[PDB]
């Protein structure tokens, strides 16, 4: 399974 | 040592088993930010502050993340140089997972500065006709796996905190976006107060608490708070290994029914570890990993290796959801950090009970 990085909320 | 301001009103914690590492990390050609031991270790501090006070709020005790400390109101940060410039290791394309690469060998041959699986790098703003002192960033700033990334800057100092100034309003920006970013280094998803807990005690940090950090009220979520306690930097348990395996859970005879304002989720669970608890979360589409701000958040413990759950939800703390389809996620915690999710599909419009 791909795992994403998580960004901060625009 | 002096004790800044927000630090004087301080809570005891637990010691933990294990410790997050902070790594300063240095372009070939970057030099640090000045004054960067005091200025971060004030900055962590408090903010270990905030995570076991908000733990402490949810019944687990005094348990905020583990630091190693250095000296007094001092963290031992590891201060890192690099085999490239600071070009090499940017915000897009891979920079984070770069950096990462090289500190997996400098971990591998320092093993003595590693005390856990769980990693926060910190890096100065670059210096451009885009950024700067003025406005940071160039730099990666996201949660990556158990690697977290945040920046540094010469403002970045706890002494502006909640001031309405520039330094001020610079800072809650990029000290709550560490605080999130750390969050998400700590097993943390994006999720969304209910409407309840908005009134109470304002923004979620794994939502746009990023933004309000020191000038709003911000907290943890309950469903936040029970995937720390399953998070190894947390622990007050030695005998318990964490991340090791596969999450091994099979659940079975899932039922979701609508009976008026009330979700009620009920079901099965077995696994070869214990199941510490059941996080639910209830959101519009689009559902990837960075479309999430929007899920609400619910949290129920459970404690066995084998068992049953039910939970009753109201759909009037789905703050925010406005969509005719819905998606409900129920993830399962197991006791050494790893977790799994189920996922269920609804239509206002045409709703219909799970049952399987
Ligand atoms: C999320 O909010 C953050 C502040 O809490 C921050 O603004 C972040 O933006 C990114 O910051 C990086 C810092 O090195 C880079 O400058 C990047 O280009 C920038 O987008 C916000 N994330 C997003 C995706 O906007
Ligand atoms: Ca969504």
């Known amino acids: ?10 | 040592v002096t004790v800044p301001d927000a630090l004087k009103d301080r809570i005891a914690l637990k010691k933990t088993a294990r410790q997050l590492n902070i790594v300063y990390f240095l372009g070939s050609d970057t030099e640090p930010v000045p004054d960067y031991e005091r200025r971060l270790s004030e900055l962590l501090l408090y903010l270990q502050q905030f995570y076991g006070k908000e733990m402490q709020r949810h019944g687990y005790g005094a348990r905020s993340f583990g630091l190693d400390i250095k000296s007094p109101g001092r963290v031992n940060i590891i201060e890192y140089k690099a085999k490239n410039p600071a070009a090499h290791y940017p915000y897009e394309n891979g920079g984070g997972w770069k950096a990462a690469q090289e500190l997996d060998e400098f971990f591998k041959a320092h093993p003595d500065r590693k005390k856990s699986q769980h990693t926060l790098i910190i890096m100065p703003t670059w210096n451009d006709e885009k950024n700067g002192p003025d406005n940071p960033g160039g730099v990666p700033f996201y949660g990556m796996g158990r690697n977290c990334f945040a920046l540094d800057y010469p403002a970045f100092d706890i002494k502006h905190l909640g001031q309405k100034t520039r330094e001020g309003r610079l800072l809650t920006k990029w000290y709550g976006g560490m605080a999130a970013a750390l969050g998400h280094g700590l097993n943390l998803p994006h999720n969304h107060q209910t409407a309840s807990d908005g009134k109470k005690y304002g923004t979620a940090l794994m939502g746009s608490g990023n933004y309000t950090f020191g000038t709003s009220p911000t907290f943890l979520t309950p469903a936040s708070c029970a995937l720390l306690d399953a998070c190894e930097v947390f622990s007050v348990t030695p005998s318990q290994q964490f991340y090791e395996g596969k999450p091994e859970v099979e659940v079975g005879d899932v039922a979701i029914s609508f009976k008026g304002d009330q979700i009620l989720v009920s079901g099965n669970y077995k696994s070869p570890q214990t199941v510490k608890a059941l996080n639910v979360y209830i959101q519009d589409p689009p559902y990837a990993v960075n479309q999430d701000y929007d899920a609400v958040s619910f949290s129920r413990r459970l404690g066995k290796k084998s068992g049953k759950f039910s939970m009753k939800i109201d759909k009037k703390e789905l703050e925010g959801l406005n969509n005719n389809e819905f998606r409900i996620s129920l993830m399962f915690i197991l006791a050494n950090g790893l977790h799994m999710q189920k996922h269920f599909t609804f239509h206002w419009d045409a709703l219909q009970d799970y049952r399987d």
């Open chain 1, 1 to 10: 399974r791909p795992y994403s990085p998580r960004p901060t909320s625009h």
